[PDB]
Amino acid sequence: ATKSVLFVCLGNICRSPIAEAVFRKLVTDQNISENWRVDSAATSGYEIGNPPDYRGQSCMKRHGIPMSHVARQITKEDFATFDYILCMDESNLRDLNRKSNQVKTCKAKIELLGSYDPQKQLIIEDPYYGNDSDFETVYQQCVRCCRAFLEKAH
Numbered sequence: 001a002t003k004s005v006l007f008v009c010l011g012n013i014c015r016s017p018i019a020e021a022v023f024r025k026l027v028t029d030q031n032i033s034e035n036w037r038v039d040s041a042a043t044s045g046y047e048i049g050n051p052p053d054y055r056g057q058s059c060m061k062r063h064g065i066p067m068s069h070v071a072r073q074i075t076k077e078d079f080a081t082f083d084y085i086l087c088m089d090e091s092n093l094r095d096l097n098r099k100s101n102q103v104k105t106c107k108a109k110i111e112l113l114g115s116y117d118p119q120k121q122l123i124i125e126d127p128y129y130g131n132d133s134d135f136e137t138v139y140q141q142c143v144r145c146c147r148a149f150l151e152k153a154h
């Protein structure tokens, strides 16, 4: 039975495509990518059609994890098809819950990705107005959370 996860952030050009790429690498490394549908989407329409922010690409290149995506906004269908929708911050979470209540079928469990962090850094903060170190922190959070999520979903 194929499992599925959608990572979600505000623009879908940084936090969620990083989480998506980190997770895809993890399952590929453990020989189970074929068992997973992995994707990412945005709560907003700010960046639809755009590639991941290059500041995030720079970070990912340093860690040797390839990343490619075209930003898209989450849709009503996503709530029906995904097992998990894992988002970055409380604002994302409130929007996703609002949207989920507008559809008939919500298969997805909607949660903060950070709820999986063994180090308990609950929020994955938007690094848009931040510096290199903020992108690195996002990356590290995604690694820790994705590993924990794969090991045992809530």
Ligand SMILES: O=C(Nc1ccccc1)[C@H](c1ccccc1)S(=O)(=O)O
Residues within 6 Å of the ligand: 009, 010, 011, 012, 013, 014, 015, 016, 046, 047, 053, 055, 126, 127, 128, 129
């Ligand atoms: O879209 C974003 N923020 C945002 C900030 C201001 C206006 C619109 C979007 C976020 C982002 C962070 C770093 C570099 C690019 C984008 S994301 O949610 O992580 O993708």
